[PDB]
Each structure stands twice: as C-alpha cells, then as structure tokens.
Amino acid sequence: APQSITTLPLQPDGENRWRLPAGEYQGQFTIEQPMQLRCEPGAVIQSQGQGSSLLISAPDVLVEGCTLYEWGSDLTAMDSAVFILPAAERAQISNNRMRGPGFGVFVDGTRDVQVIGNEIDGDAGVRSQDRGNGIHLFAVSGARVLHNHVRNARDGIYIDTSNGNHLEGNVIEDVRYGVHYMFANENSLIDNVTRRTRTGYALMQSRKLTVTGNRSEQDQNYGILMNYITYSTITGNFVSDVQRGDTGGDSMISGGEGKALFIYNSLFNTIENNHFEKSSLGIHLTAGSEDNRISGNAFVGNQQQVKYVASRTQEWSVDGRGNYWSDYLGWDRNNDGLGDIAYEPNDNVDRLLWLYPQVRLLMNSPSIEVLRWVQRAFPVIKSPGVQDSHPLMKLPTEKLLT
Amino acid sequence: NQVWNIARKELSDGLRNRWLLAISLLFAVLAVGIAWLGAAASSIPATIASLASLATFLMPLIALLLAYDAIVGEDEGGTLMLLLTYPLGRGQILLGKFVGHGLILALAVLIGFGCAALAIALLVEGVELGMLFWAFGRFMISSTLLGWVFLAFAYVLSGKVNEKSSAAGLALGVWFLFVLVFDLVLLALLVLSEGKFNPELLPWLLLLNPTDIYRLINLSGFEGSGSAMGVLSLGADLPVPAAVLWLCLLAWIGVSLLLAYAIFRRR
Amino acid sequence: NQVWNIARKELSDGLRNRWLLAISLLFAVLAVGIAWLGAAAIPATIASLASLATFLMPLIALLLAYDAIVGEDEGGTLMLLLTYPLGRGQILLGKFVGHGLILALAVLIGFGCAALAIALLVELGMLFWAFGRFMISSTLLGWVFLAFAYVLSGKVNEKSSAAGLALGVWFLFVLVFDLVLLALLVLSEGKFNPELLPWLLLLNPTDIYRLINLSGLPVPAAVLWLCLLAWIGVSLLLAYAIFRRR
Amino acid sequence: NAVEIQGVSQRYGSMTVLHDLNLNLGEGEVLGLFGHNGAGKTTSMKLILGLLSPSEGQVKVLGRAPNDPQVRRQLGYLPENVTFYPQLSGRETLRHFARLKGAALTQVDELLEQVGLAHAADRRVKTYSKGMRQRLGLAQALLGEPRLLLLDEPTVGLDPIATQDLYLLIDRLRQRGTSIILCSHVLPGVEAHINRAAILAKGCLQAVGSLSQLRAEAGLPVRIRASGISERDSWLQRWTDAGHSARGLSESSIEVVAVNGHKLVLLRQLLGEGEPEDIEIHQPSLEDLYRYYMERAG
Amino acid sequence: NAVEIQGVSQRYGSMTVLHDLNLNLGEGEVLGLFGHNGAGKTTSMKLILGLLSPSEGQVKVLGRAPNDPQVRRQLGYLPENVTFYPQLSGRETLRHFARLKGAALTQVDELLEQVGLAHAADRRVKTYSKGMRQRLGLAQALLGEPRLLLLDEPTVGLDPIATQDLYLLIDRLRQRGTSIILCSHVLPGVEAHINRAAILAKGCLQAVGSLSQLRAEAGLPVRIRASGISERDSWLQRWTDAGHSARGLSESSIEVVAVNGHKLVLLRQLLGEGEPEDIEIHQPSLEDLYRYYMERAG
Numbered sequence A: 001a002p003q004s005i006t007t008l009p010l011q012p013d014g015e016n017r018w019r020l021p022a023g024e025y026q027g028q029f030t031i032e033q034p035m036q037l038r039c040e041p042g043a044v045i046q047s048q049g050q051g052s053s054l055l056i057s058a059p060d061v062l063v064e065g066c067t068l069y070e071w072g073s074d075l076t077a078m079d080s081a082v083f084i085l086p087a088a089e090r091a092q093i094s095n096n097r098m099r100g101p102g103f104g105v106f107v108d109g110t111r112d113v114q115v116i117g118n119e120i121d122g123d124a125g126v127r128s129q130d131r132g133n134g135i136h137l138f139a140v141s142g143a144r145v146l147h148n149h150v151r152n153a154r155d156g157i158y159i160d161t162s163n164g165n166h167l168e169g170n171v172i173e174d175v176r177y178g179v180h181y182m183f184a185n186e187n188s189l190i191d192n193v194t195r196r197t198r199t200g201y202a203l204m205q206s207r208k209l210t211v212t213g214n215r216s217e218q219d220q221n222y223g224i225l226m227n228y229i230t231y232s233t234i235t236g237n238f239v240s241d242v243q244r245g246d247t248g249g250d251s252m253i254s255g256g257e258g259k260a261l262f263i264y265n266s267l268f269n270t271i272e273n274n275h276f277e278k279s280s281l282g283i284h285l286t287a288g289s290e291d292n293r294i295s296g297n298a299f300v301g302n303q304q305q306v307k308y309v310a311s312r313t314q315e316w317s318v319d320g321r322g323n324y325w326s327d328y329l330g331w332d333r334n335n336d337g338l339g340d341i342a343y344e345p346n347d348n349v350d351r352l353l354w355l356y357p358q359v360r361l362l363m364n365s366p367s368i369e370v371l372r373w374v375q376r377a378f379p380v381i382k383s384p385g386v387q388d389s390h391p392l393m394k395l396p397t398e399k400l401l402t
Numbered sequence B: 001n002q003v004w005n006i007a008r009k010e011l012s013d014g015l016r017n018r019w020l021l022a023i024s025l026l027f028a029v030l031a032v033g034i035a036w037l038g039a040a041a042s043s044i045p046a047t048i049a050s051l052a053s054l055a056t057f058l059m060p061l062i063a064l065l066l067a068y069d070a071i072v073g074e075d076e077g078g079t080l081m082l083l084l085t086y087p088l089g090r091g092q093i094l095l096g097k098f099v100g101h102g103l104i105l106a107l108a109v110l111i112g113f114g115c116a117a118l119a120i121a122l123l124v125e126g127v128e129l130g131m132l133f134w135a136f137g138r139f140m141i142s143s144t145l146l147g148w149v150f151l152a153f154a155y156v157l158s159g160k161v162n163e164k165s166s167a168a169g170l171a172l173g174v175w176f177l178f179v180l181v182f183d184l185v186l187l188a189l190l191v192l193s194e195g196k197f198n199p200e201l202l203p204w205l206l207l208l209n210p211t212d213i214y215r216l217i218n219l220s221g222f223e224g225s226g227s228a229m230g231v232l233s234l235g236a237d238l239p240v241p242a243a244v245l246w247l248c249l250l251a252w253i254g255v256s257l258l259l260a261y262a263i264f265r266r267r
Numbered sequence C: 001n002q003v004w005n006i007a008r009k010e011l012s013d014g015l016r017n018r019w020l021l022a023i024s025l026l027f028a029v030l031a032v033g034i035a036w037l038g039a040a041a042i043p044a045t046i047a048s049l050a051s052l053a054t055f056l057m058p059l060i061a062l063l064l065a066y067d068a069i070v071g072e073d074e075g076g077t078l079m080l081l082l083t084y085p086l087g088r089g090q091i092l093l094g095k096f097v098g099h100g101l102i103l104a105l106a107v108l109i110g111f112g113c114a115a116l117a118i119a120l121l122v123e124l125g126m127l128f129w130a131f132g133r134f135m136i137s138s139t140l141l142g143w144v145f146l147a148f149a150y151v152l153s154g155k156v157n158e159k160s161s162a163a164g165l166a167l168g169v170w171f172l173f174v175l176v177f178d179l180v181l182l183a184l185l186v187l188s189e190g191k192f193n194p195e196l197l198p199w200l201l202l203l204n205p206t207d208i209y210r211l212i213n214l215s216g217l218p219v220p221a222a223v224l225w226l227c228l229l230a231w232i233g234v235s236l237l238l239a240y241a242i243f244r245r246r
Numbered sequence D, E: 001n002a003v004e005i006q007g008v009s010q011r012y013g014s015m016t017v018l019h020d021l022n023l024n025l026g027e028g029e030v031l032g033l034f035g036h037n038g039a040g041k042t043t044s045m046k047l048i049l050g051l052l053s054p055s056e057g058q059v060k061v062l063g064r065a066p067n068d069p070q071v072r073r074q075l076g077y078l079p080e081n082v083t084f085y086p087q088l089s090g091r092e093t094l095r096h097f098a099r100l101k102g103a104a105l106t107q108v109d110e111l112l113e114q115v116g117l118a119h120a121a122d123r124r125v126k127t128y129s130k131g132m133r134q135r136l137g138l139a140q141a142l143l144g145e146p147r148l149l150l151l152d153e154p155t156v157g158l159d160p161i162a163t164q165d166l167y168l169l170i171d172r173l174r175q176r177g178t179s180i181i182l183c184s185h186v187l188p189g190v191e192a193h194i195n196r197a198a199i200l201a202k203g204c205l206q207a208v209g210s211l212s213q214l215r216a217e218a219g220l221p222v223r224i225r226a227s228g229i230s231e232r233d234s235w236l237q238r239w240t241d242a243g244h245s246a247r248g249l250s251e252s253s254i255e256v257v258a259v260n261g262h263k264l265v266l267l268r269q270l271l272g273e274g275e276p277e278d279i280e281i282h283q284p285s286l287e288d289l290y291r292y293y294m295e296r297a298g
C-alpha cells in the first residue's frame, strides 16, 4: 500500500494543494499529510481489487476530481474506496467517481467531513449482500453528504450512531436500502431521491431527526420505514409507488406488500405535508406507535390508506386541520379548506381482511357489501379506528409532484 | 263510536299477522342487541344514532307491512263495497284503520324500545336513569310518529291502486325512496357538487324526508361524532329549533293523512 | 312439443308482468350507473357488477317463479293442466324454459346496455370475453334460483307463504351463508381450518357466481362451471321429484 | 212504499249503464231483479245502497236519502262474492259486523244456527267453502232486523236443500215486514217466493209486476207434456185444429205448446180420449218470460 | 261403455271420502252428479281424470287407464272456478290451451262465437266477470272433439238465456256421441237434458238411473195445482177421499199432492167439476227426488 505522495502530483498552488495529471495508477494509496489534491478528469486511480484504495488519515484534506476503480470487497477489513480515519477531521471529498465491490466512502469518528457531488456506482453482479455501503458513516458529528449519486451498492447511505449531519440532495438508485439510520440522534436529511430500492428510508432507533422533502420513486415494499424514532419531523416527503417485493436478506426488516410509510414503535413525531402516492398501503401504523401529530398529508391513489390493527381510537388532525384523502367522499359547505364530515379510513371488514387473508375470497360478496353498509348505518359495531375530524378537501402538496 | 269499532278489528287482525310479529320481535331483539353492544364498548352518542337508524329501517317497514293492503286489500276482498253500506263514512273506516294500525306501531315500538331500556338499566352499572328515560322517552314518542307517517303513506298508496300486488310494489317503492334513496340522492348531490350546489338550501331538504326529521330529533342532544351522522351532519346548519322538528313530523302525518282521506273520498 | 307450447305462455305472461319489468329496468339502470362510476371515476368494475348481479339475479329469478307452481294451484289451472296431454315433468321443464329465457333476456338488456356504456366510455377484445363470461354466468346463476323457486313453490300450499320462503331462500343464499362463513372465521379458530374454506365456497351458487367473475383458488375454472350447472341439475331434479308429490 | 226509484239514468262516465228506470218496491214484497250479465243488475242495487251517485235522478229509500246513516242501520246487503277476512274466525267477523251495524252481540250466535254455520263457527274464513262463505255472507245481512235486504245471487255454490232453506228464511223475513230484493240467475224455483219480478234489459227496466201480470201481458204457451199417451201420431191432429204445434219427441210423448186460453177443452180432449199416464201441464215459467222479454228488447 | 267406475273408495288419508260407487257411463248418455257441498262431487271427477289415485278401486276410462295421455286428448274438463291467467287476454289463453290439446288454432275463434264470448274476446282475464270466465272455461273443454266432458257447475253466475244455450250446446254434443258429466246445483231445469241422474250422499252413491226410474222407484207425490178453481173449501174433500192432502195457500189455489197412480179419475174430478183457469200438474222434479234421496241417507 503506497502513499499519495509516491505518485507524480504537479503542484498548481503552494497551499498544500496538488493536481494529479491524467493517467492511470495502481494499488492502494494513503493520505497522511493535509494535501488538498485535485485531479484531471483522466486521473483513473485504479486499484487492483484489494485493500482500501484511498485511505485518508490527515485532517483537512480536499480530495477533488479523482476517479477510483476496483478496490477490494472484504467488508470485514473495510475495503473502501476512500477510507477516512478519526484523525482525518474536516475532509472534503468532491466530485469523484468510484466503481468497486466494497465500501465507497467509509468514514468513522470524524468531524465536519464533506462528501459532496460524488458518483458511486457500486456493483452489478453481487447479490446485494456483499456490495458494500455507498456512504458509510460511523459515529460522526458534523458530516455533510451533499448531492451525491450512489448506485447499486448495499444499503445506500449507511449511518451508524452519527449525531449531527445533513444529507442533502443525493440520488440513490437500485440499491437494497436507500438511507439507513442506526441510533443517529438529532440528524437531518433534505431532498434526497431514492429510486427502485428494496427500502426507501430505514429509520431505525434514531431520535430527534428531521426528514424533509425527500422523494422515493418506485421503491419496493417500504417507502419510509421508521423503527423507534422519537421527536422526529416528517415534512414534505413524497413517497410514490411502493410496489411489493422483498429485500432478499430479511435482516432488519421483513418483506412487504408495499407500504409507503411504516411506523413501528415511533412514539412522538410530526408527520405533516407529505405525499403518499400509489402504493398498496398508504401508511401502516403499528399498535405500539400511537399519539403523534399526523396532519396535512396526502394519501392519494393507495389501494388501502391506513393499516391500523387496533381498537384504540386515533385522531389524525392537529389544530383542526387534517389530511387529504383521495377516497374521501365528503363535501364542504362552509367554504374553508376542511371537509365537513370526519373520515374513517377503515371499516371492520377491512380489518378482518388483515386478520384473516382468506376473506379476500369473500371480498366481493354482497354480505360484505351489506357489512360495509351496516357499519355506516349502525355505528355501535364500528370499532374505534383511525379517523380524522376535518379532512382536507384539496391536495395540499401541489408543488411536490414537479 | 264507529271509529273504535273498526279499530278493534285491525288491532285483532294485525296481531294475527305472523309477518308483523316476526319483524316486530326482530325489532325487539335488535334493539337489545344494539344496546348490549353499546354497553360493552363503554359511546352513548353512537347508541342513539344506531337505534334511530334501526327504527328507520323497521318502523317504516312494520308500517308498510301492516297497512299496504288496508284499502285495496278490502277492495279486492269484496268487503269494501259491503262496508260502505254499514252506518259509516269513508272517513271513519280510514281514521279507524289509522287508529287500529297506529296502536300496533305504538305497541311494537313500546315493546322494542321498552326491552331496550331494560337492556341498559340492567347492563351499564351507574348509568343516569333520568337521561335514559328522557332519551328513550324521546325514542318512543317519535318512532311512533315516524311509524304513523309511513302508516299514512300506506293509506295513500293503497287508495290509488286497484290491485294488492301493485300496492306491494308501491309500498316497497315508498320504503326504498324515503329510507335509503333520499339519503343517497342527498349524499350524491353533496359529494358530486362538493357542497357548492347550494350552501343554504341543502339543510332544508332534510325536512322533505320524514326519516331524516326522525333522525334529527333523536340526534339533537347527542351530536358527538359527525361521521356517525353522515348526511345528518347538515343538521347543525338548520336554524330551526327542536320543537318545530316535532311539528314537521306531525305535518308529515296530517298532510299525508288528509291526502289519504281526499284520495279515498273518490275511490 | 308441449315443453315449448307452455314455454310460449310464460314469455307472453312474463313480458306483461308489471313486477318483472320494473325490476328489469332497475337492473339495467344500476348496471350502467355502476359502469359510469367505474370508468369516469376494467376488471375492477366487473367485480362491482358481480356484486350487483348477485343481489338482483337471485331476486329477479325469485320474483318470476315463486308463484309458478303454487300460483297455478291457487288459480286452479294446475289441476286443469294435468288433465291435458302433459306430464308433470313437461309443465315444470317448460316453465323453466319459459322463465329461463326471460332472465336470459333480462341480462341481455341488463348487461347488453352495460357493455354499450363501456364501449362508448373507454379495449373491446377483452370486453366481449369478460362480458361473455359475465352474461352467461349471470344467466346460470339466475337459473339456479329459478330452480330454487320451483322447489319452494312445490312444497308450499299457498302463494302468501311461497313469497315467505322465496324471501327466505334469498336471504340465506345471498347474505346469511357468507355471514356465517365469516362468523366461523372470526369466532371459531380452534375447530375451523381456514384452508377448508376455499372448498366450502362450492356449497353456495351465489359464491360460485362470483368466483367465475374474480379469476379474470385451489380448484380450476372448469369444475366451477360444472359446479354451477350441478346446482341447476340437482335442484331441478329436486323440483321434479317434489312436483310429483302434490 | 219502501224503495221509490224514479228517473235514474246511472252513467259510467260517458256510457249510461242504466236508463230511466222507474222502480217501486212495496213494504213487504220480494222483488226479483233478473237480466243479462251486463244488464246492470249489480249497479242497480248500488243505487239503492247510496254508494253510487244517481246521475240525473233521485233514489228514495224508505222515504229518505240513500246515503244517510240513519237508514243504513236497517239495510242488510249481501254482495256477489266476499272472501271476507281469511285470517279472522267465523264468529269474530260476524261479531265485527254486529258492532258496526249496532246489532246486539247476543244476536250473533243464534244467527249462525239460523244459517247453519255453528259446526264451522270459530274457524278461519280461509278454511271456508264458497257455499260456506255465502252462509256467512247472508248472516251479516240479517243483523238487527233490517227493513230492506239486498241479496245479489245468494244461492251460488249452494246445495238445493240449503237454497230451499234460504228462501224459507227469506219468506220468514217477508212476514216480519222486511222488503227483499233478489238479484238472481237460478230463476226456476225462486218464483214461488217473490212477489214481483223486475226483469230488466241492458239499459231499460223492461217489465215489473207479479208473475200473473207478466203471464197476462206476455202471451206465452202453456207447455202441456202428455207422456205415456196411448196414441201420439193421430194426437198430432188433436191440438193443431186448436192452433197448437203438437211436437212429439218419443213414440208416445207429445210436448204440446198450447195457447192457455182454451185449457178446459184441450184437456177434455186429453182426458176424454188417450190415457193420462203422467201429464205435466207446465205454466209459462219465470225462465219462459225471461226468454221472451230479453229478445223483445234485443 | 264410456266410463266404468267399479268399487272405488277414495280416501283423504284416513277419511274415506268416497265409498263403493259402481258408476257406469254409457257412450252417448249424459250423467248428472248431484249432492251436498261435501258429498264428493268434485273428487269423483278427479277419479275419472286419473289425476287422483284410485285407492282400492279401478277406473276404466274409455277402455283404457285414466292417466294415459292418449285418452286425455279426448277428455275436456271444466273445473269449479278458474281465474285462469289474469294478465293474459281471453283469446290468447284459448290459443294457449289449443296448442296444448293438439287442437287446431283455427278452431279457437268460432268457439268464442259458439260460446258467445266473441265481443269480450282479446281482453284480459282480470276484466272478465264470473259468468264470462265460465263461458271461457267451457270453451277450453270443447277443444278438438272430446269424447268425454266433465263439467263441475258450468252454470254458476250465468244468465238463464246462456244456461239454456249451454244445455243446447250439451245436446248438440250428445248427438255427436260424446258423454257429458254434469255436477250442478241448478237442479230445476237440468232434468230435460240429462239421461241418468247420479244423486250421491257423503260417501255412497245413493241412486242412479233416469228420472223415469227414480219416480218409479222412489214414491213421490205429483204436485198438482188448481189455480183459479171455482170453489176450494169443498174441494178440500175432493182429494182427501182419494187419499191426498188438499193444502190450499190462497183462496182458490189448492196445491194438492196426489199419488200419480190414479191421475185420470182425480183429474176427471177436476175437469168435471171446478173450472180450470190455469192448472199446474207438476211432475216430481229432480229437486224433489234430490230432497227425498238426501234425507233417506241422512
């Protein structure tokens, strides 16, 4: 494993700033000195397929314009493309291309690192169990992952116990998990787009974080999966067409029929102004995750809007403003934005179908059509569900479809 | 009096109808079953809107099962031309049939909501009996009036027809129109217009349907959840007090009984 | 053949029946009005049409033929008709042809105007196969309840209690049998195998009607057609065996 | 006079189903309305019951108005067919009518004996025959000694013993001063009990009066049958000289139709020569006069 | 022999409603079944039709079995009351029966002209009267030259012209060779056309034979009436010496019941002294023989 100074860098500026010319290189490389190296676009620093290709151990390193290729695949020895040590504080990794079967950018214990604008094409043949992480973050405070393009890695932007960091504008395509969160308290993520992914957003056991403006286009079986998140904020997310599928490993999640939002043991969080579109399940609310502010969303086009297997009532309207539902057959007499009658998204026969899947054969029966009308006529047999007084009449997310 | 002498027949003829006593015991075993399910879930405003919906399906049904063959069932039976040659008028064999069939509905709902009250005072412990007596006293003297409307509807659709098989077609037509078609026409007028057809006239269209005036009377005090009400959530927009809603229910009797007598006078 | 000579009566008597033409108009209006709200608002709308024709095609069949045998016995023509050159089989089978071609025409005005409301408000290669499977299977559902009406007419002795059983068969076979299928699910789990329940759907011709409108299931399609025709063939044989015991 | 109907032309809208009948019914006599099935027989009684309006005419029942309830207490009426109330019992429906007419309920049981329904009393009217219902239909009419009966075909579906008992029950009410109007079709037999037949055509009332007056006006042949005569073929001559057609069916049975103006000299021919085995001097019947007048109207 | 019923005993389960009737109907005669309203007249025809099972007896209709369709092609039958199909029209329902019986459809229309229901043809059966249905109910039985009729009260609610026209229609069918069975209750009048009355009690057939046989077997008085006699009170003596009760209703109307075995000498008393204005020597009718035979069995 040679070093970056063992190459031939033509210095453009005498402020520890270097420029590697166009031309291939070989083997792993190591940053031990604060060198703000740039690269020409033909600087294909191609490793041979073993080891972390560009290890960084010095603080304040502005890596720019490199093109890394074919590092190792030993995920236990953390064969990254750009490994960043805890002593390598405030590193800038700008506009880089990586293609190799391991970790793209593995950082750990660092502060204020900026991984901006990179394009990380992970793999093509590995079974999404050894592809390695795109942007792995392990207990970092200050990180800034901005406007990247990670493709075909394993579980996307992995984040483990990293406290304060922004995830802004990153495109994540054809990966296992889109953004994975593990105990990342007081986090933030803006405007990310995840496409064709076996889980769009893994939010596991991370509190107090802001999830805003993110998009998930045609992901599989879990649009936004939130496990044990508290005091969070889900504002402006656009979850579209969560089709069924399986993650293939079933490690931390299970296979789903397609849920645009799955709330698992998340106690307090504000879920406002979102857009859950064309999935099989618009929102799955588990029984342990109750009493959180869910108001202003748009549940359009979903085959079943809420799945709530409980008998506790659940009002879904804070400050008198509720959600827009596409199948809300209501009126608005007093010309405000709100509907006039409350909307129960679930019948009792819509929860017998969840308890017993053999009722799908009886789902077209007139007796079921009688039983849907008997609940609307005799409200004593209506189990206390997931209603919202004052639902919205118009679409509130008129800007999120652009 | 002759009005009671022909009431004593129908009081003793309706009680031999096996079809009445089936669906008047069905009204009794459902009003206990709703009130028992209303005791195990404890709310109170859900057990009022379901009982008022239960008597919307059955007190018009018992009224139309009783009295659809009141005039034409006597006309094609031959006993109507005989009865006018007795010292009677046509106004006495209709008002007498109205008293005679009216005491059945006054007893079919005092049996029904009577055992429903004993299925509440003996089930929910600690319930206020004054609020129970007032609410179920309001259920008793207003489900009769709903029954007496459809009783007077049945005399209208019996005097017009000349065949009892066609009277059963109209009685099914009147039961379908007033119970679960006018509630769906008003719903479809409100959903497809999104409440912008008429923001001031549409609450007054509840008064053109006595099943809706019946539901608005019993859901006066216990509004609660508007989604239990459905299109009766227009009922808060009515500026009329509760006492005129009684009077619009009596005017549905008296207009549709004076229409029943004016039709029968040129039979 | 007098199986047709008595069938021409029931066409001529059915087309002047005021009760049938009111419901058959109401059947055709509700079949366009569901199809209007299934295109402007497809297999998703042919399932909602299947729930309509499970309500009304048993009701149309029981409105035609609840007074077929006992209505002629009360009218006195049944005792007259047995003195004609007529077996008791040819009276029943000829009434079954006569009442059968009425609701074989009432679905051709019912769904014949529903298929017109889809072909002018939308694929038509899929239409004439999904509605050909719909109109045939809605007639065969109606012919079961026609044969059910001949069974209950032959048992009873008065026309008033015939409508009390025709309403009773309509309640039991449309919306009481499936409610006790759900009550055998949600209230019984220790003694109710739910894998057996896809096989208990063959004991209900309203249920077999929907299953040949839900494919486009452990059993194939061809047994399901032969299980709907077996509901005709047993109950007509039951109706002929009951009619010979008057 | 009990019923004084004058000038009535009852119209079914445009069509005048009755035309200018001037009928008078005495206070103890038994009138018989006979005619076609479209002759307006049932509708002619509706004028007397007051439930039909007399168009351009007036009906005077008992000297009073025909729809007054003061006179309907003494006006029994039996219609053509009354399947009364098939769920009620036999005794209770007669108790029901007794309360309406103001008859005492003590009259109800012995009326059932008087008509002969005591074996089938307190049984459902759906379990009754047609003849049993006619017994019940008669029984309500007799409640509370009515001054005026109105029976429209009371003997349909009825055994000829029971019809003969019925006219005895009619004639008993004739002795009590109660006028009866019969509206019949069983015309041979009823002529022994009625006082004045009132045979009417399609529109007009044709002829009223006793059977003597109808036989006096309408000259009809007496039907002498001489069954078992000694010789018949030379007895063909013994009435043709007197102006009678001597039609003979069998070898020795001349059913002669004579003039009934020479009854003694024709029978002295029959009694003097030819032996009388069994003779049927049959007067012109009620059906004979009924045959004459209806074709005389058209 | 047309109908040979021998020893048949039909039971309604336990209760044997008929018992041991040995009825023989010739190939051109016209039988008359008369009795009570529960005497089994309607059920006895069901034995002939084969629709009711002959328990412990054999019925030989036309030399064949009574349930064969080969003989039901020549067996017309009119029931008691047939409100046929009130939504069908009157011409079309007769077209319906003609297709069933194998009758040609060209035979339908002139049957309406023969029965006289041509004016009310092509009108609905609910628009028909009782008598108008009876004309229609007769008309289906006449379809396609039936060898054997069965009429159970064809003359109910029917005009006395039309009933008299009905018996002429029966007598036309007698000449063609078709046996008829009448089950009537209009017993005065029908005796001119029948060949053998068959008065039966509750279970047993009481008496059969012609009216000549019944009056010879059952001793009945001849009902003579001397209306308009000169003197009546000393004419009370003029039959009591001959053994007759000289009952007189009016002043000059003795309705004496004589023996009908000394008819000449009693009438030579009546023609010799006392003047014959109008005489009714009335033979013992079928109704009197009905009255005699029902009580004799009780």
Ligand SMILES: Nc1ncnc2c1ncn2[C@@H]1O[C@H](COP(=O)(O)OP(=O)(O)NP(=O)(O)O)[C@@H](O)[C@H]1O
Pocket: D012, D017, D035, D036, D037, D038, D039, D040, D041, D042, D043, D044, D080, E129, E131, E157
């Ligand atoms: N409501 C009516 N409207 C029009 N015409 C009628 C009505 N009721 C009876 N008619 C006609 O009136 C005529 C005679 O009526 P009706 O008084 O019944 O005579 P009728 O001899 O009593 N019939 P019947 O019962 O056989 O004796 C017939 O041509 C009927 O069609």
Ligand SMILES: Nc1ncnc2c1ncn2[C@@H]1O[C@H](COP(=O)(O)OP(=O)(O)NP(=O)(O)O)[C@@H](O)[C@H]1O
Pocket: D129, D131, D157, E012, E017, E035, E036, E037, E038, E039, E040, E041, E042, E043, E044, E080
């Ligand atoms: N299905 C039956 N079960 C029991 N008894 C019956 C039944 N049908 C008829 N009867 C009785 O059998 C008896 C004779 O019937 P039926 O042959 O009608 O005598 P009938 O004289 O012809 N009746 P009618 O039409 O008035 O002359 C009556 O007492 C009936 O009540």
Ligand SMILES: [Mg+2]
Pocket: A331, A332, A333, A334, A335, A336, A337, A338, A339, A340
């Ligand atoms: Mg509003």
Ligand SMILES: [Mg+2]
Pocket: D041, D042, D080, D152
């Ligand atoms: Mg009449």
Ligand SMILES: [Mg+2]
Pocket: E037, E040, E041, E042, E043, E080, E152, E183
């Ligand atoms: Mg009989």
